[PDB]
Symmetry: none
Subunit: 241 residues, 6 copies
């Protein structure tokens, strides 16, 4: 047992992929570990996507990880547009001028390569269909075929569709070891709660309050901290609340 | 009858193994007596294992008792890691640093012997199989072969598997006289209720509320008190609620 | 007929042995009459024995009656211990200290004589065997030989064993005129119902609710009142609900 | 035929002895006609006797009819005691005090004459024997010898004894023209059904529901209404359900 | 054959006397044809007579047919009383008042003539004797002498009496061509079945269900529909079940 | 023997006239062969005639065979009426309207020729006499004189009349080679069984069940399948039971 415990101790990964922008989030969760399902939830338009996107950006950009992004609601272009802006600390969607300026400027192309030039980000859309298996098959491919370290499922609202899916999702994450972040629309009580390993909730006015509704691994619950949305850069920043 | 009553009076063990950390629990139960089945239940991640583990630690450590631990879900190493941390008032699982520091430090080994060096704790896993008799046979051995005073079954969720098992469990405890603590997952009404001699339930936010759902021997029901989980030491502490 | 009615009127015993601790129970039943079978039932650990024991105590102690107690499940010592505590308003079973203190104190012996010194209580156990006739023969002896006014059968759970027994019990009570109180475990619909003259049920939380499920003589059904269990004295007290 | 029909029309008794206490019973049955067998049935202790007794009381008291009462189970004194109480709106059987008070008071005797002083009620018991003919012979005498208008058979539970008796009963009622009310214990499907002209069933809680299971003459079936038992007067009263 | 078939086709009476009050009965039987024996059966007091009487009333009243009614059990007056009420949509038998009011009112006589004034209905009773031939001779006379189009035999319960009678009945109907409706008491399997051309059964609660147990001519079996008995008019009405 | 076997093999007619409407009947009988006596039996009004008539219709209509029909009970017109309706999928006997409409319509005549215009069907009645030889002589003529391929004997109920007839029938069929279908009334055990080559039984409610009680040639016994009677067309249809 001794030797058995020892190696077990020295082989265990407690700290996963560290989150960004919120001082305290890592304290109460110790980051995202492989095989776990992270659930990021809150009210519509409360900043879920932004937050996740930011995590994705840092993970694949600074952590040198491969990030797959599966969009159920919006298109790839939309997603790409969002990441590009984010990476360049500008809101493309809000500036008809910038979009126009950047294309003839040649900055679009320079931006596109400096972000997707590499084999780091994998964006997939057109899952508009309500079939789970069709979805799991793509996810599995993103894992195996594209070697994605993190998979972000955007999004789900919240029957068996969700119940069974959550159970399929959790099974996929646990057996492969990928990090599966799922974005869910809330319109704790608010499978969703059960299978999810860590549940993060953002709150606003009723500056965004980051609440850790659940963390199996750590058990440490409560509010991790606050973030301040930069309307000019579109980045959620750490706060001094 | 007189002499018959007398010796009966002076031979009866009313107070069993006293519980720890919760001021009031012993008041309403008078501890754990041999031949009784203690059922500790609550919601998943509500602190069941910790609480039991704590009892186990004190029993085998301060009460000079032999404690057998049979794990159905997790591994021995995991359990050992938990007890070691607990005994050393540190959360090994939450600190990649501490785990690493303690091994080269030589504190791991010192810790391992200072806890399992003796013949006091008996951890058994690999009961992954859904066979009762296979399980009872091991328990019986832990009692007879290893002379365990207390046996902790971790865990059960939650048909006849449970019904028959609970009935087998209760039969094993009553005939041998060992103290059998069983951890059950609840997802009073929540054999489970019938065979169990004392049922303890922990409640949280939705500080942990310790509710005595049932105690045959004493009949004294209700909430025994409150405990405060120390996120730094992992110990459940008595509260001033 | 006139003279015939007259003496009949002046010779009829309407009010039997009055019950104690529950204000209203006597209103709806007019006490326990000879030749009747009183059935006290409820959920396990709901206070059946206590209640009956209390009645027994008062009957044999204050009403100057001879009470026979036949225990199928527990031992005489256990029963004696319970009555002694009850009579002395203390819970011997819950205090390892008191038991010890009382024996060297000399209070045990003083207590024993002040209760069983007389020829008032007759405790019989060892009916562990499932034979009715063996049982009826003892009951009949308790009636005839020991002249018991009240016989308490503790207990019955829960075929013909019960059916035939209930029919034998009712026959024994009717022909001798003794008061037969039977304690039955319920795990109205819940011979048991048919032969029983009065059926009392205790209800709890899932303060005890005393419900009169049936009373042939009076026909007056419903809830007689409430009782409050004194965890320190072990006595069920009348309530102000 | 014309004259034949006419006199037939003006000679036919459609409305028999009207029942009391239940608003609606007369609507669905048009009372009790001579030569008919009324069957009053229900569960033991459900109020059969009371109801019949009440009818008997009114019939012989207000309707100026002669009522014979044949008791198979209980004694005359018991029956007399019940009628006396009923007539005086008091429950003699439930008050050891009243019984005692009334005898020395001189009210017993005054009550006895004011009820049985006249030649209106004829109570007969001691039919304990299971012989039909012995029974029919007495009934026939009560009809012919004592000129009873109504005969109440109390009671019958649940072969040929009943089959043959019911057939003998129905034959006796039809040929003499007396009103035969029979009380039967039920432990429609529940000769009993066939020979009986009207079948009344009382139902309780699992306030008494009066159900007309069958009425040859009228064919009008269903629930006639509800009654409320007065625990202080022992009278079944009409309800506002 | 051609001409032979033709006239055969144009000379065949498929639709007999149409029934009334039950929407669907004519669908599955196409009415009552001459030379056929209609058997109306069901439980005692289930509405057999009423139903037949209603058919009789309409046949002789609206269809301008001559209806003979032979009563084995009851008297003519009884039958007349029933038809008169029926024709006047009132229940004479249930109203001691109406009977009395109608006679002095002069409405009885007006009613009697407006129904039996004509030579349409022929009521015969006093067949109390169990002799078939005595019965057949009267029936034959009702056919030949009184020219009855429909003969209703009321009633028969379920030997040769019935067997031979049914065979005599069927022979009489087939050779004369009259419509013979027979009412039989049932206490398909329930000559009776064999000789009868159409068998109708009424069912009640476990509103009356009209079941066509057998129809030679049509072969169309099953439940024809439902009827609703009007307790105030005594008429069976068509239902919306 | 070889050549002897060969030609024997290539000259043997195993499959006779195939039956219609019942999927499976041909499986278990392989149709009707010449020289065989087919016995169709069941309860009165169970659909015997219809079934046979249907076979007859198809045989003479689609199989281009000559079908003789000898009716013992009913008339030719009746039979013709039945075939005409059948061929035109309408129930002439059930519609006084259709019969009337079809005659003035000119459809009767068109129908008559389109069915009997040819020399395919030969209907013979008036065998009311109980003489066998008179009957055999006609049958023989239908075979020889009219060259009938199939002869349907309708009907016989299940002495020597039947015994001797069955033996004469079987002798006639075997020596001529015609297909003789006989309809028998049943009021296996139910010459009839012995001489008959194939026995078919129809059963109803517990839709008609077609049971193959016996088939010499094939030996294959049991229930061949089910049929559904079309009350609007009068045709027995194959079922999906």
């Amino acid at each position: 047992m001794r030797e058995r415990i020892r190696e077990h101790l020295s082989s265990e990964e407690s700290v996963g992929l560290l989150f960004s922008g919120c001082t305290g989030i890592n304290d109460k969760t110790l980051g995202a570990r492989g095989g776990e399902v992270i659930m990021v939830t809150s009210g519509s338009g409360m900043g879920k996507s932004t937050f996740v996107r930011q995590q994705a950006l840092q993970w694949g950009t600074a952590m040198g990880k491969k990030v797959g992004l599966a969009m159920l609601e919006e298109s790839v272009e939309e997603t790409a547009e969002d990441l590009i802006g984010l990476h360049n600390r500008v809101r493309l969607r809000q500036s008809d001028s910038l979009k126009r300026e950047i294309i003839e400027n040649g900055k679009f192309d320079q931006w596109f390569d400096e972000l997707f030039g590499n084999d780091t980000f994998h964006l997939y859309d057109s899952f508009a269909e309500a079939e789970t298996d069709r979805l799991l098959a793509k996810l599995a491919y993103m894992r195996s075929g594209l070697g994605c370290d993190v998979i972000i499922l955007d999004h789900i609202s919240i029957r068996k569709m969700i119940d069974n899916l959550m159970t399929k999702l959790k099974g996929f994450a646990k057996s492969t070891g990928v990090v599966l972040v799922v974005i869910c629309h809330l319109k704790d009580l608010r499978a969703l709660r059960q299978l999810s390993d860590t549940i993060i909730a953002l709150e606003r006015n009723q500056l965004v309050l980051v609440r850790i509704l659940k963390c199996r691994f750590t058990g440490d619950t409560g509010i991790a901290g606050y973030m301040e949305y930069n309307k000019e850069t579109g980045w959620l920043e750490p706060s001094s609340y």
